């Protein structure tokens, strides 16, 4: 049930990383956590800001 | 969109440098990017999809007006007008066969912006503008 | 219609005042849209036909084009006297831009010339039309004999006054920039508030424009 | 594209031209390696213009070398390419990468990528060509070509040709 | 005289008339003053390599169709030019395949023509070189001209040439 | 609360859900939902370590969307110690939110303008590119390939260009996912 809850995007939980284990189940508030491709997640990650006071 | 380039895909809010650049053969919202982009090289077919119009760069300009069938008549009606422009002198002050005469240009006008007759239309203002 | 209209929302889109006359305004329109000024003279009449074949139940979707039917006709026949002003900001006010296109008339001999030239004998009458000699040179007509009478009177049945200051001597004006005044306000309180005590009937008060009236009120109750 | 131009060159004699008449021993060393040879700063240097008077001033002697340097300035006509610019010219050779065409002096190169679709290779043809349904690009066919792309070394200058704009391709 | 870098300078491009900083319109020659940047047209560089030719011919003795006049000049660049001839020996007959007028009268004419156009010494030279028959045909071949000549002007010029070239 | 509170906790969570993984989300929502958190408050409501934090505060600090407080305050049994507090600078994370995704769509049209110059070479023995520009400098004498300079190996094609029209697919299709962030 929570994981068939998970997929539908309806909670939020932490699994271990040996095995896909839930733990703790938190609500979600947010709309769907696999909106973004894994290719323009990374692309992301590759930008940065220069410092605080610039922008 | 009226805003948004669907080529390029980028918005005015955080791009402001795209521009209002249609062509007159297929007017297509798109960017001066785009334009700079596909017909430098060389000319091609419209990147909207579903049109597969040659177009050249050279034939792009802004558009004036924001309705596009408005635009699209004001153009077609410069293409006729630069040849057809017998005024009131030149029917040597006849009133009625002057009214006939714009009744004449303003219905190839129509057919022109409606295609309906376009092949025998453009025979005839050929024709026309041979003399 | 259509491509008059798409006009006018092109000339609408700027961000400074224009004052131009109609004639420029026309061979504009001309020069970028091929629309001429006999076209447009018949606009109106043109509208109200096709309208009547048309045999439409509903109008109200056709105000506008009364609009700009009445914009074409008064701006293709009129070029004398008359001004097209488009403005960015119609208040400014509004945090937004709120463009407008006002096309006034100048001239208000125009609309009266016909009426004098129509009726010979004109008696032109008002209780308080001052100076009478300004009015022969607004509107464009002779007046045979022109006078005002001034009221016999027994005793003095009106007494006006005028008061240039508050009761502390300090000077009150109705300038729209120094409304916001505490002290022209509070003279002008204290002065109504005497009126209102010493008056039996009834008091009117006039003031120089709606906002004024709003301000000064608003902060008499405050 | 051909330009006449004031030029400077340093040449070095050696001590052996030391003569009576050292200097038409100078003017001929300019002759032959200027010439014909290709500068990326000025172009192709084609021919040295007003051979009776050339600035030819007091010349340093190299001081360990020990030959002559002169900066001889010399007025020449010169073809300097550039991108942007249309120019005819024959085709001299051919392949699957696409052909050559000699403009001027120098040789331009037009790409697989840089021609319209309807041409196309045939090595088949004898010489091969490129085929299109309204005209054939062979070797010495006349053909109208846009320079968009040009890169010059210290001595030696290669351009990139396209015909794919309207109004270009054979003559 | 500043030492600074400046290494940034927009690219060569004969459409935007940048042809780098050795190729303004105002050169300075060897006696000193500024002077127009000269431009040929192809029959003008065949006629002045010609006339220098001929004149290096004449120094070293004191000292029409396009069949006849390709073995003229051939035996002229042998009789005149000597070792790493290949790329006169190109251009040559580059500009006798591709010589729009023949004699000195035309080419100079033609100089006068264009002289009147008052524009820019690369754009006329390419006029004179490139073959164009319809204006917008010159407008799109050549970039400069865009808002630079009247359409009529420019149809005049080009069909005034086309009467002009011979042969 | 203010409904441009509820616009920025939206777009903020929706950053997360979209570029983080689910213990940023987790972190992010648990300062939206209690507003300053400590390294003691974060740890007992998700029950994360001290490490298992510390990629989490580290990217969210470098991004700019948690703010540190350094703030020591004495406690009854003085046994005080220089604690961290966690927060959101509103303004600033909507900045690097702002300048960030710019930047990326920046890279992405120039990545695609890369792309839309021809394909050029690549010689597969020493791995170098060649552009279009260096290939005819490299040609052979019979007029027919392109030769490596080191490896004098014939050239052949890289892809730029083929693979055009899928960085402009990939633009299109990050820009409907980016569509609610620029409409926050
Ligand atoms: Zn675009
Ligand atoms: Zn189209
Ligand atoms: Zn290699």
Not at chain 1, 23 to 36: E, M, P
Not at chain 2, 93 to 121: C, F, M, P, R, S
Not at chain 3, 113 to 124: C, D, N, Q
Request: charged share 30%; with cysteine; glycine share 4%.
């Amino acid at each position: 049930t929570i994981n068939q809850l998970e997929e539908d995007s309806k909670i939020l939980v932490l699994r271990t990383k040996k095995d896909k284990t839930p733990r703790y189940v938190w609500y979600n508030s947010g709309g769907n956590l696999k909106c973004i491709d894994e290719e323009f997640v990374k692309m992301w990650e590759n930008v940065q800001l220069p410092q605080f006071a610039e922008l | 969109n009226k805003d948004m380039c669907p080529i390029c895909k980028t918005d005015r809010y955080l791009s402001p440098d795209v521009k209002f650049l249609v062509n007159p053969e297929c007017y297509h919202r798109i960017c001066e990017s785009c334009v700079d982009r596909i017909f430098s090289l060389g000319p091609a077919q419209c990147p909207y999809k579903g049109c597969d119009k040659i177009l050249r760069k050279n034939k792009f300009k802004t558009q004036i007006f924001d309705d596009v069938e408005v635009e699209k008549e004001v153009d077609i009606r410069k293409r006729v007008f630069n040849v057809f422009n017998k005024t009131i002198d030149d029917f040597n002050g006849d009133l009625v066969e002057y009214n006939k005469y714009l009744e004449e240009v303003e219905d190839i006008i129509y057919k022109l912006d409606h295609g309906i007759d376009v092949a025998k239309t453009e025979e005839k203002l050929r024709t026309y503008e041979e003399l | 219609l259509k491509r008059l209209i798409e006009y006018l929302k092109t000339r609408m889109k700027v961000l400074h005042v224009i004052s131009e006359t109609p004639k420029s305004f026309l061979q504009h329109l001309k020069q970028l849209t091929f629309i001429e000024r006999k076209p447009l003279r018949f606009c109106s009449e043109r509208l109200s036909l096709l309208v009547r074949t048309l045999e439409v139940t509903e109008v109200e979707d056709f105000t506008a084009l009364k609009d700009i039917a009445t914009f074409a006709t008064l701006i293709s026949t009129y070029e004398e006297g008359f001004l097209l002003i488009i403005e960015p900001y119609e208040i400014e006010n509004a945090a937004v831009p709120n463009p407008i296109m006002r096309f006034t008339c100048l001239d208000a001999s125009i609309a009266i010339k016909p009426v004098f030239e129509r009726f010979s004998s004109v008696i032109i009458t008002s209780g308080t039309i001052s100076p009478l000699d300004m009015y022969p040179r607004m509107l464009n007509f002779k007046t045979v004999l022109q006078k005002s009478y001034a009221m016999t009177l027994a005793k003095k049945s009106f007494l006006p006054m005028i008061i240039t200051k508050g009761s502390d001597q300090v000077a009150i004006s109705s300038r729209f920039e120094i409304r916001n005044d505490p002290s022209i306000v509070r003279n002008y309180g204290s002065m109504l508030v005497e009126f209102a005590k010493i008056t039996p009937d009834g008091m009117v008060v006039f003031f120089p424009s709606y906002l004024y009236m709003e301000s000064i009120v608003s902060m008499w109750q405050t | 594209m051909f330009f006449i131009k004031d030029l400077s060159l340093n040449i070095t004699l050696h001590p052996s031209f030391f003569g009576p008449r050292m200097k038409q021993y100078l003017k001929t060393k300019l002759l032959e390696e200027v010439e014909g040879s290709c500068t990326g700063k000025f172009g192709y240097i084609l021919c040295v213009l007003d051979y009776d008077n050339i600035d030819i001033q007091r010349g340093r002697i190299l001081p360990t070398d020990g030959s002559a340097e002169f900066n001889v300035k010399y007025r020449a006509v010169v073809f300097k390419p550039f991108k942007g610019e249309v120019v005819d010219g024959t085709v001299v050779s051919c392949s699957q990468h696409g052909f050559e065409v000699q403009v001027g002096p120098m040789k331009v190169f037009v790409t697989k990528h840089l021609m319209p679709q309807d041409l196309t290779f045939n090595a088949g043809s004898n010489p091969p060509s490129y085929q299109s349904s309204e005209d054939v690009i062979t070797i010495k066919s006349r053909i109208r070509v846009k320079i968009e792309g040009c890169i010059s070394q210290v001595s030696s200058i290669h351009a990139i040709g396209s015909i794919k704009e309207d109004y270009l391709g054979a003559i | 005289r500043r030492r600074r870098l400046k290494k940034v300078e927009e690219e060569e491009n004969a459409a935007t008339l940048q042809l780098g900083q050795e190729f303004q319109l105002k050169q300075i020659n060897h006696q000193g003053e500024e002077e127009e940047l000269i431009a040929l047209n192809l029959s003008e560089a065949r006629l002045v390599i010609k006339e220098a030719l001929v004149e290096r011919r004449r120094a070293f003795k004191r000292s029409e169709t396009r069949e006849k006049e390709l073995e003229s000049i051939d035996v002229l660049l042998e009789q005149t030019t000597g070792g790493n001839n290949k790329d006169l020996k190109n251009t040559m007959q580059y500009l006798t395949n591709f010589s729009r007028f023949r004699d000195q009268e035309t080419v100079g004419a033609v100089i006068q023509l264009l002289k009147s156009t008052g524009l820019h010494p690369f754009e006329v030279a390419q006029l004179g070189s490139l073959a164009c028959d319809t204006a917008d045909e010159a407008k799109t071949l050549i970039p400069s001209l865009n808002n630079k000549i009247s359409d009529d002007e420019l149809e005049r010029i080009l069909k005034e040439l086309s009467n002009l070239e011979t042969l | 609360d203010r409904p441009i509170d509820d616009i920025v906790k939206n777009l903020l969570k929706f950053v997360v859900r979209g570029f983080y993984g689910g213990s940023f989300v987790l972190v992010l929502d648990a300062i939206l939902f209690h507003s300053v958190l400590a390294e003691d408050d974060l740890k007992q409501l998700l029950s994360i370590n001290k490490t298992e934090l510390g990629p989490l505060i580290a990217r969210l600090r470098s991004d700019r969307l948690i703010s540190i407080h350094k703030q020591r305050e004495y406690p009854p049994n003085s046994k005080s110690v220089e604690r961290v507090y966690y927060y959101v600078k509103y303004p600033h994370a909507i900045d690097a939110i702002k300048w960030k995704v710019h930047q990326v769509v920046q890279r992405l049209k120039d990545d695609l303008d890369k792309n839309s110059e021809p394909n050029g070479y690549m010689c597969p023995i020493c791995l170098t590119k060649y552009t279009q520009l260096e290939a005819v400098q490299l040609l052979n004498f019979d007029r027919t390939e392109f030769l490596c300079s080191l490896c004098d190996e014939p050239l052949v094609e890289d892809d730029s260009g083929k693979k055009n029209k899928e960085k402009q697919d990939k633009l299109n299709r990050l820009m409907d996912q980016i569509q609610p962030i620029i409409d926050s």
